Design an enzyme around this catalytic site. Structure first.
Site, PDB file in Angstrom:
ATOM      1  N   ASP A   1       0.844  -1.193   0.000  1.00  0.00           N
ATOM      2  CA  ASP A   1       0.000   0.000   0.000  1.00  0.00           C
ATOM      3  C   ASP A   1       0.881   1.244   0.000  1.00  0.00           C
ATOM      4  OD1 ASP A   1      -1.923   1.916   0.310  1.00  0.00           O
ATOM      5  OD2 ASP A   1      -2.421   1.404   2.382  1.00  0.00           O
TER       6      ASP A   1
ATOM      7  N   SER B   1      -0.562  15.568 -12.039  1.00  0.00           N
ATOM      8  CA  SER B   1      -0.793  15.221 -13.431  1.00  0.00           C
ATOM      9  C   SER B   1      -1.040  16.485 -14.249  1.00  0.00           C
ATOM     10  CB  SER B   1      -1.979  14.251 -13.529  1.00  0.00           C
ATOM     11  OG  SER B   1      -2.370  14.017 -14.864  1.00  0.00           O
TER      12      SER B   1
END
Length: 330
Positions: free
Chosen positions: A35, A199
């Site tokens: 994770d 992004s």
């Protein structure tokens, strides 16, 4: 040193991925959920409340000659999906894919919430975010990667998740045969303890690319892709019959649909998520309403590039003094 381990979807939907991890002496092999959105290595154990164990493999520290109680240390964690676990702490030897760390904090669960009990395939979590998020008190503990870093050939790990197929976590090296083209690296902020990056935009299907900054986290422990409501609405508007359902808890779409792809930007590069990766199947057995793999982050407080996005790429988690993230197509 290096390590290399195969990671395998837990079910036919890629709801999560499990990777075998050796703990203790002799080794006890548990299948952990790696994770990159959390920083605790915790396991089902001989200490876990018996009624909360349903098929998981447990770590038994009393059977490990290298286990030592970390005296006074406790841990307690709550995840973004509302699940939680807590317990005490041992140090022991932990190996992943041939890479061994001695003295790793192994957080033994005394209590786990129902979603963990109900998932017999996940024996615990191995956190790979920054150690500043580790929950051990009163002495915070380091992640497996942080403990291994100095010994690694290069201070990196890579995630290569499969679509409906096994993939690989590598530690200490970049497998240049595992991706196509070049790796595009992008800046990371560690201020929230995550692999947080920006992004450069998105496209829906064959549509034109929209240049816009989307701050979010690379999180192998989250199944889906959670993005701003504007972006998610633009995606589902291209799917006839798709709608956001408050009763189901997100966007659903007709199972008869063919889904468009979704592209996200990494600098000037582009990662394409095929439409099929966005199908999470019937909302309930036999339903013709299917659950979408791209969902709004509006209620979270952060955008999450979960498995839906990451499995479309070869992802480098670069833990150099100034960390960065790398993405390549594959």
């Amino acid at each position: 040193s290096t390590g290399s381990a195969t990671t395998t979807p837990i079910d036919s939907l890629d709801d999560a991925y499990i990777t075998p991890v050796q703990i203790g002496t002799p080794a006890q092999t548990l299948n952990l959920d790696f994770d990159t959105g959390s920083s605790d290595l915790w396991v089902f154990s001989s200490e876990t409340t018996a009624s909360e164990v349903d098929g998981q493999t447990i770590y038994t520290p009393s059977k490990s000659t290298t286990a030592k109680l970390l005296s006074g240390a406790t841990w307690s964690i709550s995840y973004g999906d509302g699940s939680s676990s807590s317990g005490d702490v041992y140090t022991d030897t932990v190996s992943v894919g041939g890479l061994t760390v001695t003295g790793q904090a192994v957080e033994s669960a005394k209590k786990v919430s129902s979603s963990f009990t109900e998932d017999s395939t996940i024996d615990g979590l191995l956190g790979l975010a920054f150690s500043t998020l580790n929950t051990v008190s009163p002495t915070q503990q380091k992640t497996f990667f942080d403990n291994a870093k100095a010994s690694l050939d290069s201070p990196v790990f890579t995630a290569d998740l499969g679509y409906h197929a096994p993939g690989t976590y590598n530690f200490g090296f970049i497998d240049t045969t595992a991706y196509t083209g070049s790796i595009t690296y992008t800046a990371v902020s560690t201020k929230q303890g995550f692999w947080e990056w920006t992004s450069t935009g998105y496209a829906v299907g064959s549509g034109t690319f929209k240049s816009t900054s989307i701050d979010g986290i690379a999180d192998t422990g989250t199944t889906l892709l959670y993005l701003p409501a504007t972006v998610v609405s633009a995606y589902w508007a291209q799917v006839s019959g798709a709608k956001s359902s408050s009763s189901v808890g997100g966007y659903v779409f007709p199972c008869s649909a063919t889904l468009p792809s979704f592209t996200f930007g990494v600098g000037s590069a582009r990662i394409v998520i095929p439409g099929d990766y966005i199908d999470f199947g019937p909302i309930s057995t036999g339903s013709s309403s299917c659950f979408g793999g791209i969902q709004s982050s509006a209620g979270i407080g952060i955008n999450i590039f979960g498995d839906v996005a990451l499995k479309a790429a070869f992802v480098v988690f670069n833990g150099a003094t100034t960390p960065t993230l790398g993405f390549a197509s594959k």
